[PDB]
Design a protein around this nucleic acid. Structure first.
Length: 397
RNA sequence: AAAAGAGUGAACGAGAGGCUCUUCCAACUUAGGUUGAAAGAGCACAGGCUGAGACAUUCGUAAGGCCGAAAGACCGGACGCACCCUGGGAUUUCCCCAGUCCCCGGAACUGCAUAGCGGAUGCCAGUUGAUUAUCAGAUAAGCCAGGGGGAACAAUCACCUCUCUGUAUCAGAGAGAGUUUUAC
DNA sequence: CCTCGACTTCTAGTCTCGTTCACTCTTTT
DNA sequence: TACTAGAAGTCGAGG
């Protein structure tokens, strides 16, 4: 039934075994040492022959659901994994990063320089200047001082430059392949190619993935077509599911596969957690709330950009000066994240002794986290949980 | 080859708002306090690096075409610059990267000319300590900062069978040679 | 019948406009 | 979007 992955005494991956009673005997007798809780990996502690058969790794690429499966020369299944990529979050984070950077440079540098210039008298006499910059046909308005030099004419990128999102997706594919290599002795690699007319990040990265996979597996790299996968499915009767695709892909490179049958059993699930979080501010509240008694009646002095609720100006329009004189203002202070916190993806044990993978930290009182939420959605009192293992980028669930 | 279609990276510039303080005018309330209007000044992740580099006025910025009496304008693109290129560095770390920026040079490539750079003038800092000299300190209108991966770090016993308990499902605890080799 | 620890439930987080530039892939014709 | 900080709420313990 189950499959136990085996590693040689030298750290070399070996053929997985399914005897599962020899495994327990070996573990009790001390000849085998557990390497990974899930997928269950054991390393032999004694030298032995390392005969291996060829294995084929089939990849169904995607932006948020990568699928891979390892098969023997006859179409038997020994590994099936489905990875939920963190890719969608990267462009939004990068956009927010750009906005924060522009805010920094506008408010801490440009506005301060303009303020100093007005103070010192070293400003334009007109106070405003229209500047026609090379490469532009319409001027920019510079108030009280020259602009910092604008650089857009001749910025060059190395050939085959990839955006952080596409690079992240490519690196994710390669990293998950490396993790599979740590477990099994992969011999051949098959990739399913995708072309999108749109009349996408994955479409951008497919050729680079093919190149670098070919480098990783010299002479042992094949490519298949989506139509080929569909025909294989129809011919061999594999049930139509998303995670089965990879298996079918892996079965294309087999010359004569007599034991083709759909894998039975849920595949391993892999979650991607960010390695770094450089942000220091949680909430910069920035909303001057006006309460009359205990009811919110206004949100700013004058309505801000993209604000729909009434501000103080409307309230002054509607009510009287004796009403305004009684208002109370409440502006909460900015909140900062703990940057040394236990990041999501960490592995901890609860007070009752159950092991879990951290998903989020919920609540905070007196400078200490209230609840740790596991990847299964169970809340544990953080004071009693014990920290075992730091975040690895790709984590089995 | 171009045409479009889908994405997602970079520089610079304007605001609506926000925080602190001052002046002044109202309103409400135990000269004081709270709220607001108007005018003004300062301030913009937590932080890392650095000691000067920001701004204003003005002068200079190739040869050769070409229009002008001339002054000068236009084209062009170097002996001028650079976002380009070789090398080094800050952000920078447990190991790396992206992005931005800086320094000395400039073979080819790429780009700029109302830009950028250099000079002159003006304006905006900080000066203390240990042994006039050296190290350290202070010194912003300086640069970067909300992006990504990997390593290492388990109280890491999985599956199946039996027993107990809770529990509708099922889960927790204990025990176990379950074909022989993890690969024939 | 209060008060105070120890948890438990629940909510909320900044936006816009300009001047330009760049890279990767796909498809047609 | 969603992880994370923090305000308000609930419940016993105890005197």
């Amino acid at each position: 039934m189950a499959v136990v992955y085996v590693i040689s005494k030298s750290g070399k991956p070996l053929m997985p075994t399914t005897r599962c009673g020899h495994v327990r005997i070996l573990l009790k007798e001390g000849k085998a040492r557990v390497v990974e809780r899930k997928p269950f990996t054991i390393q032999l502690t004694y030298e032995s022959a390392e005969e291996t058969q060829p294995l084929v790794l089939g990849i169904d690429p995607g932006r948020t659901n990568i699928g891979m499966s390892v098969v023997t020369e006859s179409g038997e299944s020994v590994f099936n994994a489905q990875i939920e990529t963190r890719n969608k979050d990267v462009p939004k984070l990068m956009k927010d990063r750009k906005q924060y950077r522009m805010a920094h440079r506008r408010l801490k540098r440009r506005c301060k320089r303009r303020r100093r210039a007005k103070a010192a008298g070293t400003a334009f006499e007109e106070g405003e200047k229209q500047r026609l910059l090379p490469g532009c046909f319409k001027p920019i308005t510079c108030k009280s001082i020259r602009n910092k030099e604008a650089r857009f004419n001749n910025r060059k990128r190395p050939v085959g430059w990839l955006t952080p999102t596409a690079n992240h997706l490519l690196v994710t594919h390669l990293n998950v392949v490396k993790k599979v290599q740590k477990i099994l002795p992969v011999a051949k690699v098959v990739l399913e190619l995708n072309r999108f007319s749109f009349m996408s990040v994955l479409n951008q990265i497919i050729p680079y993935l093919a190149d670098q996979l070919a480098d990783m597996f010299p002479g042992n790299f094949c490519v298949t077509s989506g139509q080929d996968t569909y025909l294989f499915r129809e011919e061999h009767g594999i049930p139509k599911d998303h995670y089965l695709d990879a298996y079918c892909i892996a079965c294309s490179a087999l010359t004569d596969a007599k034991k083709v049958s759909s894998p039975k059993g849920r595949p391993y699930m892999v979650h991607q957690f960010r390695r770094h979080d450089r942000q220091a501010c949680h909430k910069a509240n920035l909303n001057r709330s006006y309460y009359m008694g205990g009811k919110l009646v206004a949100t700013n002095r004058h309505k801000a950009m993209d604000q729909k609720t009434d501000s103080l100006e409307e309230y002054r329009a509607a009510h009287s000066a004796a009403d305004v004189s009684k208002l109370t203002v409440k502006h909460p202070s900015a909140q900062y994240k703990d940057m040394s916190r236990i990041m999501p993806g960490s592995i901890l044990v609860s007070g009752e002794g159950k092991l879990f993978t951290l998903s989020r930290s919920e609540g905070r009182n007196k400078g200490q986290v209230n609840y740790f939420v596991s990847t299964e959605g169970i809340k544990y009192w953080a004071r009693k949980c014990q920290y075992l293992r730091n975040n690895g980028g790709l984590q089995i669930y």
